[PDB]
Design a protein around this ligand. Structure first.
Ligand SMILES: C[N+](C)(C)CCO
Ligand SMILES: C[N+](C)(C)CCO
Ligand SMILES: C[N+](C)(C)CCO
Ligand SMILES: C[N+](C)(C)CCO
Ligand SMILES: C[N+](C)(C)CCO
Ligand SMILES: C[N+](C)(C)CCO
Ligand SMILES: C[N+](C)(C)CCO
Ligand SMILES: [Cl-]
Ligand SMILES: [Cl-]
Length: 431
């Protein structure tokens, strides 16, 4: 025996201490870097190599470096992988310049997940491109082709963008991207598809707001009249519609009878509320208001009512339509919290909001929600008695409420285009 460790120092085959050099220890079967001070490197990098705790050079292994806040992979010769792909534990990883593992990002036509692994047979919504992509079996994005995914057909355009609300040859991609296999009503027409997706027939329809025999009516997509000649066209607006440049233009050109204006959501005022109220008041356009709730309990509900009342007085609101508690299956952007799923909690929440508003002197207060929620979570006599504005973007509402009787609204669309407004608009028929 000749060469040996002496504390932090290494004595070579001769009598001399190692200095500024790599040594291979046959006992450990490992490489070590000895520094200019004669001591082994550990828990640190030397050029392309990482020396682990105790000095051992990393080889064929992952290292997480807390200083760089990144994973690195040391190859068979110990050098860090960089600007290259590596197959490790039967998954593909990509290493960027300086060895940083790619994560939650594209590398050309491939996408690396939060763990660094190349994704395969997976949907990806990328906010950076504002669209859906599908990573195929080989990891590359679907491109200028059909893919059958989860038992349904989707079409991918140039650069991988999932087709939606559009045609591809004889096939129509619906809003979810899924190929139409039934019927689609659009363009004032009914499109009938084979179960296999090819268009079979188009039939023109009597639908929407129609002026007929000297009067105006609303027809649902089943070609059924909703209400009478006095049916009203009500839009609902928020900061999400942007700044409305010319309110009078919107009203006249689109024959709009009234507006429900977003107050905001629990704890925050809508950015366009001040402007919208100023203009609607100035022009004497009839309006009501709504608040999107993130309530979890009666305390939140009371706070919602307090907020509502504060805003009404602040902006001198003149309410021709009701105050609406907009109740949906809410979820925090960060997913930390979501709406209570039980009916009894919502009975408490909704009635606390109503009671608080009523005690404050506001007697024209109702609930808005979606048909699906009203059939399930919100299906209770003490909730339904307050519901007179229902959303269902369907061919007919086909929903009865035994607990409310009187004037009511059906929000039949969130995709209408109107003169004087940028982008899509929510519209209701009031009857
Ligand atoms: C491997 N060293 C000898 C350098 C340290 C472990 O005792
Ligand atoms: C090159 N080293 C000596 C640093 C180790 C094995 O490649
Ligand atoms: C691996 N890094 C390049 C990030 C540091 C070592 O030189
Ligand atoms: C170590 N990674 C998390 C980077 C990949 C292996 O699961
Ligand atoms: C290594 N690549 C990612 C380029 C191909 C594996 O499918
Ligand atoms: C999928 N895109 C082509 C749009 C970007 C990533 O390569
Ligand atoms: C594209 N998906 C099928 C994942 C849903 C779209 O909303
Ligand atoms: Cl390297
Ligand atoms: Cl619904």
């Amino acid at each position: 025996a000749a060469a040996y460790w002496d504390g932090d120092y290494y004595v070579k085959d001769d009598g001399s201490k190692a200095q500024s050099e790599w040594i291979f220890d046959n006992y450990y079967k490992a490489w070590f870097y000895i520094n200019s001070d004669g001591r082994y490197s550990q828990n640190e990098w030397h050029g392309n190599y990482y020396l682990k705790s105790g000095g051992y050079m990393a080889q064929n292994e992952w290292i997480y470096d807390s200083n760089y806040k990144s994973w690195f992979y040391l190859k068979s010769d110990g050098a860090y992988a960089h600007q290259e792909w590596q197959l490790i534990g039967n998954k593909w990883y990509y290493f960027k310049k300086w060895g940083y593992m790619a994560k939650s990002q594209w590398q050309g036509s491939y996408f690396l997940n939060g763990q660094g692994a190349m994704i395969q047979n997976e949907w990806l919504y990328d906010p950076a491109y504002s669209a859906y992509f599908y990573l195929k079996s080989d990891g590359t994005y679907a491109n200028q082709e059909w893919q059958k995914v989860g038992g349904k057909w989707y079409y991918f355009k140039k650069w991988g963008y999932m087709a939606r609300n559009e045609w591809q040859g004889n096939y129509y991609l619906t809003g979810s991207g899924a190929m139409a296999t039934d019927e689609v009503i659009m363009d004032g027409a009914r499109y009938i598809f084979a179960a296999s997706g090819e268009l079979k027939e188009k039939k023109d329809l009597n639908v929407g707001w129609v002026h007929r025999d000297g009067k105006r009516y609303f027809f649902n997509n089943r070609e059924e009249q909703v209400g009478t000649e006095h049916a009203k066209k009500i839009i609902d607006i928020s900061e999400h519609n942007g700044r409305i440049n010319d309110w009078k233009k919107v009203i006249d050109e689109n024959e709009v009878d009234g507006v429900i204006v977003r107050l905001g959501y629990s704890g925050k005022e809508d950015k366009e509320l001040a402007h919208n109220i100023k203009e609607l008041n100035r022009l004497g356009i009839p309006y009501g208001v709504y608040l999107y709730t993130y309530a979890e309990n009666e305390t939140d509900a009371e706070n919602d009512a307090k907020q509502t009342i504060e805003l009404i007085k602040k902006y001198n609101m003149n309410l021709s339509y009701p105050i609406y508690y907009d109740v949906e299956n809410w979820e925090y952007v960060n997913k930390s919290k979501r709406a209570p799923s039980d009916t009894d909690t919502w009975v408490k929440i909704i009635n606390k909001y109503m009671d608080t508003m009523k005690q404050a002197g506001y007697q024209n207060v109702y609930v808005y929600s979606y048909r699906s929620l009203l059939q399930t979570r919100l299906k209770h006599p003490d909730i339904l008695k307050h519901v007179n504005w229902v959303a269902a973007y369907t061919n007919a509402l086909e929903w009865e409420n035994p607990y409310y009787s009187g004037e009511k609204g059906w929000q039949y669309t969130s995709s209408e285009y109107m003169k004087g407004i940028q982008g899509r608009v929510d519209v209701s028929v009031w009857y």
